């Protein structure tokens, strides 16, 4: 799992009747999952070490 994140939370009182705000976020992420676990193959997983 790998990610590069960013966040800007902003909150502002404009005048005596208005208040605005924003919560901006974003990321670039790379995932990869070991997608043979949970099943029985020959030399795979902890079943393979056993």
């Amino acid at each position: 799992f790998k990610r590069y994140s960013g966040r800007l939370n902003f909150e502002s009182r404009i005048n005596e009747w208005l208040k605005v705000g924003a919560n901006l976020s974003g990321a670039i992420a790379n995932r990869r999952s070991a997608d043979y676990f949970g099943k029985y193959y020959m030399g795979s997983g902890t079943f393979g070490v056993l």
Binding site: K39, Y40, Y41, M42, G43, S44
Partner: peptide
């Protein structure tokens, strides 16, 4: 990869 060894119990919950 490889050959699949059978007789599993199907997981629910």
């Amino acid at each position: 990869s490889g050959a699949t060894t059978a007789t599993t119990t199907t997981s629910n919950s």
